[PDB]
Design a protein around this ligand. Structure first.
Ligand SMILES: *[C@@H]1C[C@@H](O)[C@@H](O)[C@@H](CO)O1
Ligand SMILES: [Ca+2]
Length: 837
């Protein structure tokens, strides 16, 4: 049902048919697909298949396969003469596209956007059929990719004379000094003349605050007449003087719409909008990163693309929720390891104020490595980037073309350890406004290839990323290469489960397929969170850090990882990662509050581990339990209240010492008499407390030695011995969502005792009854070795918590979700859905 009522670019996600099959040939329009599954995109056809130990642990034991997507739709007569194109923000992988039986082309890479023109084969005034074949033979990748059309699909309908796809490039080369007054904008606009007659057009271009009207423009320009031959294109340059634009920054992500109208005489033929933000960055070899002339430490996380129980589906609300949970931790930057992000993530970070280091590739047997250095066939009409060299150039320029105007994107990352020099040149030619980079692992060993490749980055205005360097290695790079601007492109790789306290050690396979929540567990080549941050926060020349990872992701379940088929350990084997600060369900681990005490200067943190039940704590020498406090306060007083008492007694008091760097960054370290012999562990506080039923509570004091109001800080300011499990506590993060068939509500359910305290080891199976104008689309507990179906109506809680994800329908109404558990009191939440205006 495509006609003239839809916008220039319109949502094309609804009403597809899907079939998983390696034998069908379903490209012909007359193919009978009446027995196929009916799905709304985005869609992941790996996440619904069963785990199998004949698959690979690194990709979560889930299969791939060959998936077919079909959509039959109408093109109304009122679109005769118009240009029509279908745009894929991502298809994993090896896509083949037919339109009305005619093959249009292929796209190997599973992570980059691409499009196809439909005009040449369209049946105007009749039925049309688009077919997409997806092939994921599952040697695959080092992490869970998912399979299928896992990102949004859109249709673009334009006049014959129109702005090209991603056709507007914006530069503000003097912003750093023009800031506050008139800012010069240099724009380049690609205008295509897909008619059979010569076109003579002008452009009217306007810059106005996002969501506003054109009468609020801070700058406009009309260009002189440009002649464009029939079937040709032209690059129209123009200059706008923007009157005192609001800068885009982390705290104030002010956004603008740059509207381009293609006029013929006094008639608008095409109107193209692009999102923009005014900001400039800088990387200094001595003092690190700056945003809008102000020094900023890159407090970053590496993030894979999948969304937990939803698989690879790039749902906008799922992505938005991730960024919001990271922001509460104090994260200000995301590295899209190791592939282009969904456009949805770029939109979210533009709106939320998060700096994005957008990575384009991982490395440089049937995977993308075969296609990286191959040319694009002459009869492959795929569109998106340059087609004159290799697929790598196409996918790189396609990503840059999509995101070149996004203010959140500060850097282009080219990979993660001849070809390097080619990628760097392609990036600089494609977008000169941002530095390029990559994460190099062999800089530690100081290979001659790393010295050369690092100098080549700097010579082209790039920034050097070093993977898993410690403080000594940071200093060696700084001394050996005084001209390099460096940062920790991949750090920490601590491995932890959520809610595990009966031991404080880890870093290797255990006996319960879980790992300690204490920050004493990391892979051999990595470091614990306190060690990786201590080395960065001391050094102004280390611009920042990108912790591996922010969220747990499917696949790579190190220390239970495995290349090749076969279970690692006893089945069911761990199938998602342990690197994340937050688990796949969005539930933070304990180290989340360490980072928050280090990074979030808008909140106060006071967090105690472990949970204070005898069957979950670790008893060391003298039956003492190691108690850890994460906090940003200057001083902490620790108390203990015996079970059945209302009076607390002081059991310790420790003050932080504040350190300041030359650039002005401040951090805290404990230098008391009983400090830890490992310096980085003194970024938090530790007490050895004898076990006894009761409550351990903490009070926070500021630099003036005065109390911080309790309850106003984040984290568990106290831990108490709980009773047995008695009731469930459900809570929806959003109690009203949009009835568009896309919006989600996340319902965390906690297992609590009769007094509401979370039972720290509770694993009761919780059943979800979803009624009304919504559907259950996922259940999750973040537990790596749990193989229960994400699409079931039930799941065991893990460490006292379980998650339910409900999706709206396209009819406004109410959703009722009841969480049930044998012997426990149920909990019910109600979510309203509101129609789209
Ligand atoms: C850095 C590269 C990333 O893909 C992960 O494999 C990580 C594991 O520690 O190291
Ligand atoms: Ca703080």
């Amino acid at each position: 049902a495509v006609d003239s009522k839809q916008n220039r670019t319109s949502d094309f996600d609804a009403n597809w048919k899907f079939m998983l099959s390696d034998s069908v040939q379903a490209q012909d329009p007359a193919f009978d697909d009446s027995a196929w599954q009916q799905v709304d995109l985005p869609h992941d056809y790996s996440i619904t298949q069963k785990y199998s130990q004949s698959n690979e642990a690194e990709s979560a034991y889930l299969p791939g396969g060959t998936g077919w997507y079909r959509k039959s739709f109408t093109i109304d007569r009122d679109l005769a003469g118009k240009r029509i194109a279908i745009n894929f923000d991502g298809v994993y992988m090896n896509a083949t596209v037919w339109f009305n039986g005619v093959k249009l082309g292929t796209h190997p890479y599973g992570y980059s956007p691409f499009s196809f023109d439909l005009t040449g084969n369209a049946k105007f005034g009749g039925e049309n059929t688009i077919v997409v074949k997806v092939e994921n033979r599952l040697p695959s990748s080092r992490w869970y990719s998912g399979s299928g059309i896992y990102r949004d699909v859109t249709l673009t309908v334009t006049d014959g004379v129109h702005v090209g796809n991603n056709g507007v490039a914006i530069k503000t080369p003097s912003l750093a000094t023009q800031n506050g007054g008139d800012v010069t904008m240099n724009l380049t606009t690609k205008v295509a003349n897909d008619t059979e007659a010569a076109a003579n057009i002008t452009l009217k271009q306007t810059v106005f605050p996002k969501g506003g009207k054109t009468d609020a423009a801070i700058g406009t320009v009309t260009t002189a007449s440009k002649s464009i031959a029939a079937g040709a294109s032209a690059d129209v340059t123009s200059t706008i003087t923007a009157a005192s634009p609001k800068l885009w920054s982390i705290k104030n992500p002010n956004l603008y719409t740059v509207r381009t109208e293609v006029l013929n005489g006094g008639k608008v033929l095409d109107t193209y909008d692009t999102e923009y933000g005014f900001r400039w960055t800088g990387f200094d070899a001595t003092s690190g990163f700056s945003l809008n002339g102000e020094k900023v430490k890159l407090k970053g996380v590496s993030m894979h693309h999948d969304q937990g129980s939803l698989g690879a589906v790039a749902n906008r609300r799922a992505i938005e929720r991730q960024v919001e949970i990271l922001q509460k931790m104090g994260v200000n930057s995301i590295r899209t390891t190791h592939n282009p992000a969904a456009k949805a993530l770029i939109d979210v970070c533009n709106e939320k104020g998060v700096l994005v280091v957008e990575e384009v590739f991982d490395m440089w047997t049937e995977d993308y490595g075969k296609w990286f250095g191959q040319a694009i066939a002459g009869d492959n009409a795929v569109l998106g980037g340059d087609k004159d060299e290799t697929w790598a150039k196409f996918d790189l320029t396609s990503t840059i073309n999509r995101d070149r105007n996004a203010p959140s994107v500060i850097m282009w990352s080219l990979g993660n350890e001849a070809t390097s020099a080619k990628l760097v040149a392609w990036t600089k030619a494609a977008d000169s406004t941002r530095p390029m980079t990559y994460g190099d692992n062999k800089i530690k060993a100081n290979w001659n290839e790393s010295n050369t490749m690092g100098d080549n980055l700097t010579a082209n205005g790039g920034v050097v990323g070093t993977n898993y360097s410690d403080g000594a290695n940071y200093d060696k790079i700084r001394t050996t290469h005084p001209s390099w601007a460096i940062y920790g492109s991949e750090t920490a790789s601590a491995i932890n489960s959520r809610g595990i306290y009966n031991r404080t050690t880890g870093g290797a396979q255990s006996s319960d397929k879980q790992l300690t929540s204490y920050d004493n567990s990391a892979v051999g080549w990595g470091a614990v969170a306190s060690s990786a941050w201590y080395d960065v926060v001391q050094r102004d020349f280390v611009a920042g850090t990108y912790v591996w990872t922010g969220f747990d992701y499917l696949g790579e379940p190190t220390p239970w990882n495995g290349t090749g088929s076969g279970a690692v350990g006893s089945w069911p084997s761990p199938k998602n990662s342990y690197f994340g600060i937050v688990d796949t369900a969005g539930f933070p681990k304990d180290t989340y509050y360490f980072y928050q005490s280090q990074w979030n200067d808008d909140v106060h943190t006071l967090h105690i581990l472990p949970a204070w039940n005898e069957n979950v704590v670790a008893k060391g020498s003298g039956n003492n339990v190691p108690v850890v406090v994460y906090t940003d306060a200057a001083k902490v007083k620790l108390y203990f209240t015996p079970k059945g008492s209302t009076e607390k007694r002081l059991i310790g008091e420790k003050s932080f010492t504040k350190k300041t760097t030359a650039a002005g960054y401040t951090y805290q370290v404990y230098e008391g008499s009983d400090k830890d012999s490992t310096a980085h562990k003194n970024m938090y506080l530790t007490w050895n407390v004898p076990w006894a039923e009761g409550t351990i509570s903490a009070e926070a004091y500021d630099e003036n030695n005065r109390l911080i109001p309790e309850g106003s800080t984040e984290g568990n300011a106290s831990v108490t011995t709980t009773g047995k499990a008695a009731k469930l506590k459900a809570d929806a993060d959003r109690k009203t969502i949009t009835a568009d068939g896309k919006d989600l509500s996340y319902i965390e359910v906690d297992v609590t005792d009769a007094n509401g305290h979370i039972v720290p080891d509770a694993a009761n199976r919780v059943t979800f009854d979803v009624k009304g104008a919504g559907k259950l689309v996922g259940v999750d507990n973040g537990s790596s070795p749990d193989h229960d179906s994400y699409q079931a109506d039930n799941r065991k809680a893990f460490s006292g918590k379980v998650l339910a994800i409900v999706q709206s329908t396209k009819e406004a109404g109410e959703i009722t979700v009841t969480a049930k558990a044998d012997g426990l009191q149920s909990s019910t939440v109600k979510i309203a859905t509101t129609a789209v205006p």
